[PDB]
Amino acid sequence: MSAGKTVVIALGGNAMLQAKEKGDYDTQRKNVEIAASEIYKIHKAGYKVVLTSGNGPQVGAIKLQNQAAAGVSPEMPLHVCGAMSQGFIGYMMSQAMDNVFCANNEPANCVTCVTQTLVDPKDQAFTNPTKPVVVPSPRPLEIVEYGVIKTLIDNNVLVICTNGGGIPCKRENKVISGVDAVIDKDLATSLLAKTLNSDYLMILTDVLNACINYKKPDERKLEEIKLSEILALEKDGHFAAGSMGPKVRAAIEFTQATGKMSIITSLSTAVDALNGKCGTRIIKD
Amino acid sequence: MSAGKTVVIALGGNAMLQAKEKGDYDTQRKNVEIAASEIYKIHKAGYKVVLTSGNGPQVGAIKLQNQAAAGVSPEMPLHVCGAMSQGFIGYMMSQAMDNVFCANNEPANCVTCVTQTLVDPKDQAFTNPTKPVVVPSPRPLEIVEYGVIKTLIDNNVLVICTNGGGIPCKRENKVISGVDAVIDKDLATSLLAKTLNSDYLMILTDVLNACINYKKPDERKLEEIKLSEILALEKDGHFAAGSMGPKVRAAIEFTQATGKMSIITSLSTAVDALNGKCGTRIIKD
Ligand SMILES: Nc1ncnc2c1ncn2[C@@H]1O[C@H](COP(=O)(O)OP(=O)(O)NP(=O)(O)O)[C@@H](O)[C@H]1O
Ligand SMILES: Nc1ncnc2c1ncn2[C@@H]1O[C@H](COP(=O)(O)OP(=O)(O)NP(=O)(O)O)[C@@H](O)[C@H]1O
């Protein structure tokens, strides 16, 4: 209801695929349902929820489909593939969230918004690509649908958006047009959440704590931790540029900007980390 | 713009494709641009708008790729293809819409919602496919996201949804799951329009008017017609079940339920029909 604080939640790969699980519909559905049970608890606890996710495996599969049917069907550019993946992913999360609602005798009240994320065309990353092949991962500037998203949470709708970090776009002399690229879903969710001026940013992943000296002897799992300690641990290089790196960067940005707690944890214990009982919680300088 | 009347607008195939055009992204993009101009005028005129469309060619192209690559990537079902066509199409309309707002120096305020539509899973169509090769077309019973759509127009947001008629679904024992149909985009929009209790239902196509004796020596283009008169015209069988039939069905039902007017016109004379100056306009007795 209306009284509730807002928490912005970024699901990871494990909301749809477990390690070595294959990309079929029913397998992914089962994962989302499970994933939706954890989320419902957060909404039941009285929190206002905005859901986000990644789309890597899903958009890759679509792009896999568009390339291998090229002779029988026109081949869509990456950014459009991104788009079909939002309908796909959105659909699933929409459906599952409604089903967990009804299961609890609460009338369904959530939706999925196609989302476009503007990026700077003059981004360095256009000129030094990454993961497949070869493709930019530019910083998110703006969530184009931000305004409607705020309207929806101001009305206590459970909003699902930015799945995959948003459809990458640019605006040049008043024209938005899609670009061929990908955006880190976590940076994108930091972006939304600070604009929303949210009360929390949660990044949900498969590990229950960020660590330093990760997979190593003197390993240490981060718990509740101050902004300055994590800023220092980051330049120390503890976080991997392809996994944990963006997340911490995501959490650090949002906490720096709003003073509000950001959280990294297992999808399986989301509510506990909110209640203070575990997970890496970055708090305020 | 909290003062404007509401018009539910159902776009047709030509929002994205002209006679014998190729299902590629740029060919459909620029078609959508053209529709977006027409729509903007309506919005500029002061009306609240809900935007709908069909998806046949697009879901078809998607359903096509999923089989052409069923040996590289896993093959998705019909309703998930639907959810993919929705992301993609909604993407195009979203971006085009936003671009035309910017071109008029007006701040963007538009959204595409992923949409589900409940149907009875033992509808007669699951016993005799019969929609254009002939396929099913079950009767739409519920737009799941109705509540959020309602909310979104109450806030004067320009809402795009039920693209392609909505992802076909059904709800057994508190569980919504996807069926493998396609819904008539016009019936579905009639449902929404009358649930929203809109001031207008408008179905935009590639002909200026519904006719009787179509393409036949004594062809009468219908203009402004009371509901009783068009009921009796329909029963006689002037409206081919492939094309105009369900459009008139949709108009009739909407007007029978609300007493407000429905419309069938060409996409580019939409504002004129609203100004009473043309097009088939069905009204109450
Ligand atoms: N310093 C670290 N602490 C904890 N885990 C780490 C660290 N560095 C790398 N990792 C790994 O990062 C993994 C989680 O990130 P990741 O593989 O990207 O999953 P995800 O982000 O939830 N999915 P997705 O959003 O689809 O990319 C963990 O399983 C760890 O294996
Ligand atoms: N009695 C009739 N009067 C006028 N047009 C008719 C009639 N009967 C059939 N038609 C045709 O129906 C066509 C419109 O419907 P249709 O061909 O299905 O396109 P659409 O419904 O606008 N697209 P979509 O949203 O993808 O289903 C017109 O172009 C007419 O050629």
Numbering used by the authors:
A (entry chain A), B (entry chain B): 1 to 132, 164 to 316
Text from the published report:
An AMP-PNP molecule binds to each of the four subunits within the crystal asymmetric unit. AMP-PNP binds in a pocket flanked by amino acid residues 11–13, 235–250, and 267–278. It exhibits the same interactions whether CK’s auxiliary domain adopts the open conformation or is disordered, as the nucleotide does not interact with the auxiliary domain. Of the two homodimers in the asymmetric unit, the auxiliary domains of only one homodimer adopt the open conformation while those in the second homodimer are structurally disordered. The following interactions are common to both structures. The loop comprising amino acid residues 245–250 undergoes a conformational transition upon AMP-PNP binding such that the side chain of Tyr245 (Tyr238 in efCK) stacks against the adenine ring and its hydroxyl group forms a hydrogen bond with the ribose O2′ hydroxyl group. Met275 (Met268 in efCK) side chain stacks against the opposite face of the adenine moiety. Present in glCK-AMPPNP but absent in the efCK-ADP structure is a hydrogen bond between the O3′ hydroxyl of the ribose and the carboxyl group of Asp237 (Gly230 is the equivalent residue in efCK). However, no electron density is associated with Mg2+ in the glCK-AMPPNP structure reported here. We therefore propose that although catalytic activity requires the presence of a divalent cation, the metal ion is not required for nucleotide binding in the active site.
Carbamate kinase (CK; EC 2.7.2.2, ATP:carbamate phosphotransferase) reversibly converts ADP and carbamoyl phosphate into ATP and ammonium carbamate. The enzyme functions in the L-arginine dihydrolase pathway, operative primarily in some bacteria but also in the enteric protozoan parasite, Giardia lamblia.
